Design a protein around this ligand. Structure first.
Ligand SMILES: Nc1ncnc2c1ncn2[C@@H]1O[C@H](COP(=O)(O)OP(=O)(O)OP(=O)(O)O)[C@@H](O)[C@H]1O
Ligand SMILES: Nc1ccn([C@@H]2O[C@H](COP(=O)(O)O)[C@@H](O)[C@H]2O)c(=O)n1
Ligand SMILES: [Cl-]
Length: 304
């Protein structure tokens, strides 16, 4: 009820994600890695207000306010052009991004932004583009965009774009530790390739047991099953992340893991109150930039 919702605008919330499970396979023909991941959408979201305008524009507040490009480099720019081309219209809209999702943090914030734009423009124009086509467009924009449309909890395969919804039969309570800087996703995938050239480090087991924990609604069962094969790459590049993980664990978290390609650390807690406690101890531990509490699963990109 603090969202920017001027008359004639359409405002869409799209959530950040954490990978509860991320197995990384072979580098494909197309230059991407085959993935098996369980995506999970959390209450740390971006809020995107789109309006008809005389030209395409982007403005950003919140996370990355100084920082995030507002020209063609922005994934929301690309999304606006793509959606407009799909519907046979010029991308004549102003896009305002109120960001809580960290920049370059492994929570797919730009992908949330791009997904929101698709949904917002469809509604703003009453363009009638069905969910399956919005999904195809999202897939063109990037691997994490379709999940940002989809929300909830989901098994991503292929590059991450092919989604099968899974049951997460509870509210799960999270603490996120935002890092001092960011990591470039391509560098983290390159780094896992490099770590596998050097040795044969351990791979995750099948997702079966983790999926069963999720379907049971059981955070304590789930915690030790969480895992992310990019975590070794992210900690290779940012060694300090081990201190962050150790601190959140020692603060009371059931489990900590790097989210995605990092450097955000995610901490699964047993209750809301437990996360209150863990987040406080962690902010005073001197190990990360800033801390958040969040819950999941939440809905995918949705008109507010
Ligand atoms: N709307 C946006 N929000 C944040 N970063 C953006 C956006 N558009 C383009 N970027 C650029 O993309 C990179 C960061 O993207 P993002 O913040 O989505 O990383 P991420 O959240 O780690 O992505 P993923 O976890 O899906 O790989 C930076 O190079 C940044 O300049
Ligand atoms: N499945 C995936 C997803 C992303 N990536 C790496 O991350 C980069 C960004 O991918 P997206 O644009 O799909 O987010 C790719 O160019 C690639 O280097 C990958 O190598 N395998
Ligand atoms: Cl979908």
């Amino acid at each position: 009820v603090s969202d920017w919702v001027p008359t004639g605008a359409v405002t869409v919330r799209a959530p950040g994600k954490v990978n509860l499970y991320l197995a990384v396979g072979d580098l494909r023909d197309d230059g991407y890695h085959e993935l098996t991941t369980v995506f999970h959408a959390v209450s740390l979201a971006d809020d995107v207000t789109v309006r008809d305008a005389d030209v395409l524009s982007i403005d950003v507040v919140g996370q990355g306010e100084g920082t995030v490009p507002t020209d063609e480099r922005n994934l929301a720019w690309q999304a606006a052009e793509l959606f407009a081309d799909h519907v046979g219209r010029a991308p004549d809209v102003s896009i305002f991004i109120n960001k809580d999702i960290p920049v370059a943090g492994g929570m797919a914030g730009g992908s949330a932004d791009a997904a929101a734009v698709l949904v917002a423009m469809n509604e703003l124009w009453h363009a009638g583009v069905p969910r399956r086509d919005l999904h195809h467009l999202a897939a063109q924009l990037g691997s994490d965009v379709p999940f940002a449309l989809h929300g909830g909890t989901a098994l991503g395969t292929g590059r991450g774009e092919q989604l099968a919804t899974v049951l997460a039969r509870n509210v799960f309570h999270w603490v996120f530790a935002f890092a001092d800087g960011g990591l470039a996703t391509p560098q983290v995938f390159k780094e896992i390739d490099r770590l596998r050239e050097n040795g044969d480090p351990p791979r995750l087991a099948e997702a079966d047991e983790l999926l069963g924990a999720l379907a049971a609604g059981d955070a304590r069962r789930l915690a030790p099953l969480l895992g992310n094969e990019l975590q070794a790459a992210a900690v290779s590049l940012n060694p300090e992340l081990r201190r962050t993980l150790r601190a959140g664990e020692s603060a009371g978290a059931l489990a900590g893991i790097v989210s995605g390609s990092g450097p955000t650390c995610a901490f699964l807690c047993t209750s809301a109150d437990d996360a209150v406690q863990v987040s406080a101890e962690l902010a005073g531990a001197g190990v990360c930039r800033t801390v958040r509490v969040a819950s999941g699963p939440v809905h995918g990109a949705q008109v507010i």
